[PDB]
Paper text:
A number of enzymes, termed fructosyl amino acid oxidase (FAOX), have reactivity for fructosyl amino acids as major substrates. Some of these enzymes, which also exhibit reactivity for fructosyl dipeptides as F-VH are specifically termed fructosyl peptide oxidase (FPOX). AnFPOX-15, which featured 11 amino acid replacements in AnFPOX-1 exhibited significant F-VH oxidation activity, whereas reactivity for longer fructosyl peptides such as fructosyl tripeptide (F-3P, Fru-VHL), fructosyl tetrapeptide (F-4P, Fru-VHLT) and F-6P was never observed. The overall structure of AnFPOX-15 consisted of two domains: an oxidoreductase FAD-binding domain with the topology of an incomplete anti-parallel β-barrel (two β-sheets with eight β-strands) and four α-helices at one side of the β-barrel; and a catalytic domain with two β-sheets (eight or two β-strands), and two long α-helices (helix 2 and 3) that locate at each side of the sheets, and some short helices.
To assess structural differences between AnFPOX-15 and AnFPOX-21, for which the largest improvement of F-6P oxidation activity was observed, the obtained X-ray crystal data were structurally analysed. AnFPOX-21/[name] was crystallised and the structure was determined via molecular replacement. The crystal belonged to P65, and it contained two enzymes arranged in an asymmetric unit. Although all amino acid residues from P3 to N434 were identified in one molecule, but S61, G62, and A63 in the other molecule were omitted from the final coordinate file because of the poor electron-density map. No significant structural difference was noted between AnFPOX-15 and AnFPOX-21 (rmsd = 0.436 Å and 0.441 Å for 431 and 427 Cα atoms, respectively), excluding for the structures in mutated residues, suggesting conservation of the elemental architecture of AnFPOX even after gaining significant F-6P oxidation activity by introducing seven mutations. With respect to AnFPOX-21 the B-factor values of the Cα atom of loop A (S61-N64) was significantly high even in coordinate-determined chain (S61, 94.22 Å3; G62, 84.36 Å3; A63, 94.43 Å3), suggesting structure flexibility of loop A because of the mutations. As S61, G62 and A63 have a smaller side-chain size in AnFPOX-21 than original AnFPOX-15, the mutations also alleviate structural interference for the entrance of bulky substrates. The surface model of the AnFPOX-21/[name] structure illustrated the opened active site gate even after [name] binding. In addition, the active site gate of AnFPOX-21 is apparently wider than that of AnFPOX-15, and the thioacetate moiety of [name] coordinated on AnFPOX-21 was observable from outside the molecule. This wide-opened gate of AnFPOX-21 is expected to be advantageous for F-6P accessibility and reactivity because the larger space should permit longer peptides to be accommodated.
Numbering used by the authors: 3 to 434
Amino acid sequence: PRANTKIIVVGGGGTMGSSTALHLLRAGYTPSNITVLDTYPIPSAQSAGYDLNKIFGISGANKPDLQLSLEAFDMWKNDPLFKPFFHNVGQMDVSSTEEGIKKLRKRYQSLLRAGIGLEKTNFLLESEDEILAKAPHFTREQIKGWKGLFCGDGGWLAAAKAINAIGQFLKEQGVKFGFGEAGTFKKPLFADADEKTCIGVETVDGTKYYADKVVLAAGAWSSTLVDLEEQCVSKAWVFAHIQLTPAEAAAYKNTPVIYDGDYGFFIEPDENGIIKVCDEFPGFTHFKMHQPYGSPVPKLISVPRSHAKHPTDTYPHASEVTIKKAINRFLPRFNDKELFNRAMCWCTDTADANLLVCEHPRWKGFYLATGDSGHSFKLLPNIGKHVVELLEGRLESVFKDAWRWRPGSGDALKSRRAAPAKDLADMPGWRN
Ligand SMILES: *Cc1cc2c(cc1C)nc1c(=O)[nH]c(=O)nc-1n2C[C@H](O)[C@H](O)[C@H](O)COP(=O)(O)OP(=O)(O)OC[C@H]1O[C@@H](n2cnc3c(N)ncnc32)[C@H](O)[C@@H]1O
Ligand SMILES: O=C(O)CSC[C@@]1(O)OC[C@@H](O)[C@@H](O)[C@@H]1O
């Protein structure tokens, strides 16, 4: 029974982590039986969720991605905890290349074959007038040849503030916490020498925590903490900020999120006039020799270079070009705006960009909740709901089979992106 079951959430200061803790409380677990451990206090300074904003949009990449995105959309609008941080201003995919414009038309078409009425909220913008109508800040000369796929369920998310909302709720309820060395996972604990029964974890300062179940929601660090047998390859993405005056930023107030697969995106300025800009690229790895728990020998493993641990870090020289390229493409009027708060942000890719949410195959009681594949912040309100379903063996098979333990199911280095990710060692500029 839930009221006497103890759960440990490793990486609980992050996205999937905090979500799991939230839905444990909502399910009826006793708050004092739930322990959140993270290297950083919630909201974790190093979770990929620690950002001014993230994009919300509907992805049809998989069978349950569609179901999950709509589920998340519902909560972002109607859940009292989350709905303050959803800005439902819409999201527009654009392209002016032949190859790219056809990608849009195929995406629109598969949304219709979902047969769940997505045509009511997704539209192909076939002319420049239709684009300028949704995003008046563009000039017509800037967008000639552009077509757009507009999603009315889209918009952006106050990412850090949202996780923080969960965290403060967890604390009011009485969830237990472990931060710093007292919260940094090192290894699982077992009752038996055969390590078939996990009964807790031990952190790096030596602290041992005991629970009935352990959830590993450590994002890009999961593949480094325990042997995931190359299922998850951690990669970095980049962003930068520019500052606008109240006059300049007024033209972008409540404007839709604009994305082009060949350039990146930007999100409307926040209350301080700050615009976040991203490029799009297959990501950056950081391979090192490491020996995650359960691996018999040290392997080559992409290990996150945490901006939180190294604040003087920025990103490779190459990324500076593509980010500015994106700025020129979308916001040419701000090309002389100096960039600041450059930083790398880490995700972990699976081969098929599906999550890795399953019980460990040998360590009974140890559960994996990661494989976010760099598309999963939008799932903050509802992913924890399905992790709990897994813990209780009530997980709908569509999710269960898609999220199953699956080593040898593809090359996660390339995943579903344009190319295998390049490594930080071959991309100078980020260390200072
Ligand atoms: C990097 C990035 C990601 C991203 C994005 C843009 C960038 C630049 N834009 C997104 C977007 O527009 N829309 C979207 O839906 N997602 C976007 N993302 C990715 C999204 O953030 C991630 O997919 C999502 O955050 C999933 O993360 P989850 O797996 O929870 O991972 P996390 O938030 O980083 O959490 C990791 C927590 O791990 C804790 N940790 C790490 N190591 C330990 C150890 N050793 N022990 C205990 N805890 C550990 C960290 O505290 C961290 O909080
Ligand atoms: O999937 C989305 O809703 C937008 S995520 C945008 C992005 O920058 O986020 C970081 C990585 O996921 C990249 O793959 C990706 O291009």
